[PDB]
Amino acid sequence: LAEASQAHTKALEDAKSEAHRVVEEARTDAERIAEQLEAQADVEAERIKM
Amino acid sequence: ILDPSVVGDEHYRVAQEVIRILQRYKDLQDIIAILGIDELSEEDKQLVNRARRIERFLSQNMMAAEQFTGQPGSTVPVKETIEAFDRLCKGDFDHVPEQAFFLIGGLDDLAKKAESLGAKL
Amino acid sequence: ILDPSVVGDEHYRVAQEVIRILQRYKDLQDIIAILGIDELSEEDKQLVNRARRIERFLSQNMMAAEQFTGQPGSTVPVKETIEAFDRLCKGDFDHVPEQAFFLIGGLDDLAKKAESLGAKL
Amino acid sequence: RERDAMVAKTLADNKKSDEQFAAAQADYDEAMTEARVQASSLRDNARADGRKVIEDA
Amino acid sequence: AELNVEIVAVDRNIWSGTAKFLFTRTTVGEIGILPRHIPLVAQLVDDAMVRVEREGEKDLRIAVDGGFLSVTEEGVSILAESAEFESEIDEAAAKQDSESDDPRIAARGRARLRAVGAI
Amino acid sequence: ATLRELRGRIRSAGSIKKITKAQELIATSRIARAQARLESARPYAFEITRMLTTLAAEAALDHPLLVERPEPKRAGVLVVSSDRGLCGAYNANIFRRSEELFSLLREAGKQPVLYVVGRKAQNYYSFRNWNITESWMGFSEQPTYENAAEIASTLVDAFLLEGVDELHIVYTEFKSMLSQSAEAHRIAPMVVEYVEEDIGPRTLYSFEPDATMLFESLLPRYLTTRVYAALLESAASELA
Amino acid sequence: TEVIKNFKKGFAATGVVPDEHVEALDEDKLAKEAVKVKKPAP
Amino acid sequence: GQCFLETDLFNQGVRPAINVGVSVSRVGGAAQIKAMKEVAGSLRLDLSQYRELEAFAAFASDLDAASKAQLERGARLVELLKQPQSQPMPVEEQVVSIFL
Amino acid sequence: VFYLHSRLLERCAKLSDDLGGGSLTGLPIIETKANDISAYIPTNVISITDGQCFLETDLFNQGVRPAINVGVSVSRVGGAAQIKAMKEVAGSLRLDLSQYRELEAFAAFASDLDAASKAQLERGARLVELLKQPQSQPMPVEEQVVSIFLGTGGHLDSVPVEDVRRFETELLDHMRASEEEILTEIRDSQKLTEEAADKLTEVIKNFKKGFAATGGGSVVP
Amino acid sequence: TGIKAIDAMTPIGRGQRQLIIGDRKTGKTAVCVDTILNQRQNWESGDPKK
Numbered sequence A: 001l002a003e004a005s006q007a008h009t010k011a012l013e014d015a016k017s018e019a020h021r022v023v024e025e026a027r028t029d030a031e032r033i034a035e036q037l038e039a040q041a042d043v044e045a046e047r048i049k050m
Numbered sequence B, C: 001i002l003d004p005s006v007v008g009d010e011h012y013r014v015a016q017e018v019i020r021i022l023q024r025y026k027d028l029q030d031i032i033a034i035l036g037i038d039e040l041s042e043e044d045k046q047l048v049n050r051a052r053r054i055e056r057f058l059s060q061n062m063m064a065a066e067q068f069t070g071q072p073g074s075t076v077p078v079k080e081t082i083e084a085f086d087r088l089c090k091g092d093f094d095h096v097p098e099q100a101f102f103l104i105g106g107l108d109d110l111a112k113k114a115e116s117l118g119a120k121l
Numbered sequence D: 001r002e003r004d005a006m007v008a009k010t011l012a013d014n015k016k017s018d019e020q021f022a023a024a025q026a027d028y029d030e031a032m033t034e035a036r037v038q039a040s041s042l043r044d045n046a047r048a049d050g051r052k053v054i055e056d057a
Numbered sequence E: 001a002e003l004n005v006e007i008v009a010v011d012r013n014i015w016s017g018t019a020k021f022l023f024t025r026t027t028v029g030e031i032g033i034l035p036r037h038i039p040l041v042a043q044l045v046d047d048a049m050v051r052v053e054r055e056g057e058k059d060l061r062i063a064v065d066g067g068f069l070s071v072t073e074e075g076v077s078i079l080a081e082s083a084e085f086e087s088e089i090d091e092a093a094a095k096q097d098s099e100s101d102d103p104r105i106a107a108r109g110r111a112r113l114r115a116v117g118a119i
Numbered sequence F: 001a002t003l004r005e006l007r008g009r010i011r012s013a014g015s016i017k018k019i020t021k022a023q024e025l026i027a028t029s030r031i032a033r034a035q036a037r038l039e040s041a042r043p044y045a046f047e048i049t050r051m052l053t054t055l056a057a058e059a060a061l062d063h064p065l066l067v068e069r070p071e072p073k074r075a076g077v078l079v080v081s082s083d084r085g086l087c088g089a090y091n092a093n094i095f096r097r098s099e100e101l102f103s104l105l106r107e108a109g110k111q112p113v114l115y116v117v118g119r120k121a122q123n124y125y126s127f128r129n130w131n132i133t134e135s136w137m138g139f140s141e142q143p144t145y146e147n148a149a150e151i152a153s154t155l156v157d158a159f160l161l162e163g164v165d166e167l168h169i170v171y172t173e174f175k176s177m178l179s180q181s182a183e184a185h186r187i188a189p190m191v192v193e194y195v196e197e198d199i200g201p202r203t204l205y206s207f208e209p210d211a212t213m214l215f216e217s218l219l220p221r222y223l224t225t226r227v228y229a230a231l232l233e234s235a236a237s238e239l240a
Numbered sequence G: 001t002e003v004i005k006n007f008k009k010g011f012a013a014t015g016v017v018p019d020e021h022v023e024a025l026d027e028d029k030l031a032k033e034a035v036k037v038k039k040p041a042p
Numbered sequence H: 001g002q003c004f005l006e007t008d009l010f011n012q013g014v015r016p017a018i019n020v021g022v023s024v025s026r027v028g029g030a031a032q033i034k035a036m037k038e039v040a041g042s043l044r045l046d047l048s049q050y051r052e053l054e055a056f057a058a059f060a061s062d063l064d065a066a067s068k069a070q071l072e073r074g075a076r077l078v079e080l081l082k083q084p085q086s087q088p089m090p091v092e093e094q095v096v097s098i099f100l
Numbered sequence I: 001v002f003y004l005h006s007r008l009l010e011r012c013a014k015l016s017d018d019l020g021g022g023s024l025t026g027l028p029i030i031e032t033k034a035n036d037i038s039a040y041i042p043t044n045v046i047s048i049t050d051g052q053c054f055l056e057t058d059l060f061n062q063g064v065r066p067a068i069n070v071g072v073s074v075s076r077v078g079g080a081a082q083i084k085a086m087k088e089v090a091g092s093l094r095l096d097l098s099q100y101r102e103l104e105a106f107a108a109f110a111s112d113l114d115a116a117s118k119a120q121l122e123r124g125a126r127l128v129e130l131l132k133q134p135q136s137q138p139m140p141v142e143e144q145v146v147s148i149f150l151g152t153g154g155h156l157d158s159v160p161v162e163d164v165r166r167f168e169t170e171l172l173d174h175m176r177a178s179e180e181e182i183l184t185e186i187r188d189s190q191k192l193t194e195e196a197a198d199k200l201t202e203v204i205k206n207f208k209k210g211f212a213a214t215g216g217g218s219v220v221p
Numbered sequence J: 001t002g003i004k005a006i007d008a009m010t011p012i013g014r015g016q017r018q019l020i021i022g023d024r025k026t027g028k029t030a031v032c033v034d035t036i037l038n039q040r041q042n043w044e045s046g047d048p049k050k
């Protein structure tokens, strides 16, 4: 029983902080994507300008 | 102009799904005629029911046909058409009979003719 | 001219036996490809293994492959071909591995290949 | 009374043992699937308002 | 010594092996077979259970439904409509099955209980 | 004009051919499985037959299922046919055999009562204004022992009684993977067949509580086992 | 409507197993399920 | 318009052999008295749909109750429209029979 | 008229090095009627050209777009007109689709099929969903190599068939943002050496554990 | 061509005659317009051999 409960919460916080890892990677990729696409946006805008 | 950029992506997706369902039904029709509908999949039997209801729901009572049927015509906005056929391709009307989809307008007339035939919607 | 009055009776017999075996293997190939190999019988397997051996022995080290492999092409006299395929259909080589039959000439090349692959008889 | 209670609790805490073992994977998968739908809810909003500004620009 | 035991269901061979002793319950009363024994034919009780005892293993408990039993010079043969080993039983499903009003499934549940060491 | 129609008919025939080839290979697989099921159900039947014979050699052979009632008035016919229809002359042979059996029964003054297993038999007999007492559908592809138990129980309870005086069954015996023969068996009342002596210094059995109770509680189980074997053989035959 | 309804009651619409002429099965082709008892007792 | 007659429909007993799926009149209810226009309003579309349904359900084992009702009604209509040669009906009797 | 078209289409050539080495690639378009490739002008231009791409309306309606019938389409030049990476990852593709097309009659009986047969069925469905492509969105050859690597390396057996496209899309997106080195050295060396394949496989596994299907389920092996 | 089906199954070389044949409204003009658009990055490279 002691074995199982300690393993339980060990896996619990393992999961929690690794989920933070994946989701923070996600938000960095989100800012990356916004950057690249808005660059595309107004570099197309100037295309129609000329 | 049946293009994702012109008519929007929901319109386009619904149209493509209608066309795919009807093409699969046309592919199955000869097998159904010879071997009977019971030799198909359950996937395919579901698709055949949906496709027959779709083929019937595309028909409409037109204003210029009141001389051939005696029944006045109806107008269906494009958003109501998109919503209706989205529900049809998802399967929300698999219980309503094949008729009550035949020569009607939008969804409320579908409800009326379904209750005239003993069904919900 | 695959007719007894031209090639001889034994040539015709061997060719007809090879064609019968290959056609029966062609019949069994689809049930093999969909259901698996030992869904079949063991008579069917005997035939399938013999047919694989025969179908692979029809290949040859062609004179056009010498430019890519360096080894000279083969020229198998028709009598030796008849003898080889007669023995193949009789079952005299059902134990030699299949790869021993790819791109070889007469019977002696088959024997040398079998020896360099650890089998004979 | 204490011996039967003893091995009764014993089988009961074997019960509880593997039930906690299962709960481990239970809310592990819960947390990480939450994380998946979070990581894809994000970065799809980003693409969406990306197209927002593509078109107004 | 050992006796050959074979338990055959209506559409499957449930078990087959050798045993040291074999306890069950005929409609006439409980019974225990040993490697040599009189030729005998009997009908297990409706919620019978079959405990096989082997020399080097733990005893194997089986629940049997509608069984018949016969002992001969070769060994024991048990004929069952259905059989379920001990390490295959939900004791809670068998428990709620035991309290049914239908006698057949009630006997099924009682046998499944007897196999798991309850009741 | 008819060029379009001819190309369309070529496409139709190609679709039909694809489907039928698929169905043939599927049937090959399924009959492998059905033969497996039949062969694995065989041993229990063998051993219950042995137990029944060694019970009957020392009991009282006056069970209702064993005496031929004087002046039989009606016979029960169980016709085992299929649900799906892409079989060949399977149901056809079944029905012609059952018609021969009906004429045999009527040439001896017995009006047949009809029980069927499957959809095709119900079509064949509902078209001909027959009165089918009880029907059974949806398990001719994979029959289990509970279906056989239900069928045999209803049959023996209609026999022991609106009440019949003998039970026949018409099913397709499976053999050879190329032999499928519609056979009519008489499952009740059984004829008794003194085989042999085969009893010298042999040791007598012991029965608990006695011989006849075991015999009379084992006979309906024997009839149910026979009905189960019939269902399995007819399934394998339908797949062939 | 009422004329049709009062007419349909008196209408005489024109709506038994056939023979099939199938011969009798041979009495020995009908298989008999037997208990094969091992005590010879004619 | 056109009244397309067929030899298959003729041999099947359908006389006149008018193929209702392809037959049509481009004047319509204006070429009818009001009684017949109200009575035989959607008869041609009903019979076309019935022929389609009976061609689809040619081998189907069990169908909806509405499909069965439609099959029976379409049949009865088919046998109602058959008519011998050299045997005309006044427009009132035709109105009454299509009302039936 | 055969001369009219063959005189035109034989001026598309690949010149030798002593003529400069220039080239003219031809893409003649022919519009058939009711898929009658046995007509006169279709027959002529099929006879003339070095390969054919047969587009069909039945494939177009089923959602297969571009509606290229890969069973009858052909290129008589073949692997000589490919880079090493694409010649490797797509030499597996032809008979995969052949097996899938001859197995799709058993789509409703995958329970009765052998292991390898059901494997071929699933792989073929995935590969058919792989070759689909939007309009006016061409991909460079490195991204095509990566996508067909997804297809034929087996990294799509975990993804639902109704999720392949999006999956591939997002993966390429990820690879364009994070791991550009794989695409770069594919573009520069024209070959996908084993180490690039290792890094690509690991990238695919990470993206998988980050990817969320539409049914909510997982895509991790 | 930038099209996976073509570039993988029926590759086109430089100097080859590839027929695009189809009924109508099947996507032939789209195939050729995408083959044209795919040469944008080769044009940006400024290399006369590409």
Ligand SMILES: Nc1ncnc2c1ncn2[C@@H]1O[C@H](COP(=O)(O)OP(=O)(O)OP(=O)(O)O)[C@@H](O)[C@H]1O
Residues within 6 Å of the ligand: B002, B003, I065, I066, I133, I134, I135, J022, J023, J024, J025, J026, J027, J028, J029, J030, J031
């Ligand atoms: N890859 C694709 N994905 C989705 N839609 C496509 C694709 N290719 C073409 N289409 C659609 O198919 C329609 C027909 O395309 P296209 O005009 O290229 O065919 P076509 O061969 O030129 O036909 P026609 O020459 O008879 O006009 C277009 O409206 C286009 O939107």
Ligand SMILES: [Mg+2]
Residues within 6 Å of the ligand: J028, J029
């Ligand atoms: Mg065009």
